[PDB]
């Protein structure tokens, strides 16, 4: 079946540098988008979404024309002390009444020092 894996538990980065938060899924099926969030609670912040919204400081590590891509690592540019926290890589299942959450990675601690 499929698992969403975040290998790095902690990572950090000086101000103005690029932090890499890596994520890899085992399989593409069930079909669904991969989203990155900061925090686990109800008021969590969407960090990256491929289809909609603009996330300027986020770049996809797997890069374009990566066919059948299963590497869902992200890169957050120009890091500030404000962007410190725990980031979760979550897999979603395609669903109407709005999509549904399926599996979430352990999480990667980001700091700033």
């Amino acid at each position: 079946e499929l698992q969403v894996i975040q290998p790095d538990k902690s990572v950090l980065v000086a101000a103005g540098e690029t932090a890499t938060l890596r994520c890899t899924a085992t399989s593409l099926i069930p079909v669904g988008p991969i989203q990155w969030f900061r925090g686990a609670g109800p008021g969590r912040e969407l960090i990256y979404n491929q289809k909609e919204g603009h996330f300027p400081r986020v770049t996809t590590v797997s890069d374009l024309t990566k066919r059948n891509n299963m590497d869902f690592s992200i890169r957050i540019g120009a890091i500030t002390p404000a962007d410190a926290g725990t980031y979760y890589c979550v897999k979603f299942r395609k669903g109407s009444p709005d999509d549904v959450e399926f599996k979430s990675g352990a999480g990667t601690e980001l700091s700033v020092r």
């Epitope: 079946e1 499929l2 399989s27 593409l28 099926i29 069930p30 079909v31 988008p33 991969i34 491929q50 289809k51 909609e52 996809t60 797997s62 890069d63 374009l64 024309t65 990566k66 066919r67 059948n68 891509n69 869902f72 299942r93 395609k94 109407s96």
Partner: antibody
């Protein structure tokens, strides 16, 4: 190389049933979604259904009548069609799904198609 | 739910010239567009996915461009093989996949 070979298509009455099979080869059938797309005579392509790994999706005109099934032990994709309507007459294509980057699911390889004829 | 409209539904071009046709969508802003080529007695084959990415084994003449609602497929030098029907497919928003009406590239005489 990737090959998709359909079978089980023929002529049946309205309201009859028919089962289509598409045996996949040349790629890891277990790690990809598979799709059926039909094309009526003298008209364009229309998407029917899509299966992933227990998640199934159906077209609006098809929701209640058709069920997509796959068996990884046979590397085959199935589409059993029940309560067949006369308009459902089309050439049924089995296709393999592929994703670019983080956006997902266009059709890279298409089967040669099996002809189904719903008529009295 | 996102319907694709293809204009020049039929397009008459001379061999060796250039043919350009457009696909238009409602409610999709991104590049999740695919182009397909189908010959009369044959199954469709993928030419371009993600608007501008040309599939392997496809000649350089075929080229896709555009984003948002307007998209276009271009062939530099029309050959005998290129005369077929061409469909656009979006995978941006789908519980239901959707195909374009199709543009048939036709020989002009």
């Amino acid at each position: 190389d990737v090959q998709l070979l359909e079978s089980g298509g023929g002529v049946v009455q309205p309201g009859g049933s028919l089962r289509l099979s598409c045996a996949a080869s040349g790629f890891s059938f277990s790690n990809f979604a598979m799709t059926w797309v039909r094309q009526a005579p003298g008209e364009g392509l229309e998407w029917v259904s899509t299966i992933g790994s227990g998640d199934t999706y159906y077209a609006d005109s098809v929701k209640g009548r058709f069920t997509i099934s796959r068996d990884n032990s046979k590397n085959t994709l199935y589409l059993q069609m029940n309560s067949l309507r006369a308009e459902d007459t089309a050439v049924y294509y089995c296709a393999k799904d592929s994703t670019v980057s983080w956006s997902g699911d266009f059709f890279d390889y298409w089967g040669q198609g099996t002809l189904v004829t719903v008529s009295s | 739910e996102i319907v694709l409209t293809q204009s020049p539904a039929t397009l008459s071009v001379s061999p060796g010239e250039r043919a350009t046709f457009s696909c238009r969508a409602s409610q999709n802003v991104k590049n999740d567009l695919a182009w397909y080529q189908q010959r009369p007695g044959q199954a469709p084959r993928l030419l371009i996915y993600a608007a501008r990415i040309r599939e392997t084994g496809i000649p350089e003449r075929f080229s896709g461009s555009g984003s948002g609602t307007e998209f276009t497929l271009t062939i530099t030098s029309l050959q005998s093989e290129d005369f077929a029907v061409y469909y656009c497919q979006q995978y941006y928003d789908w519980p239901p996949f959707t195909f374009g009406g199709g543009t048939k590239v036709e020989i002009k005489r």
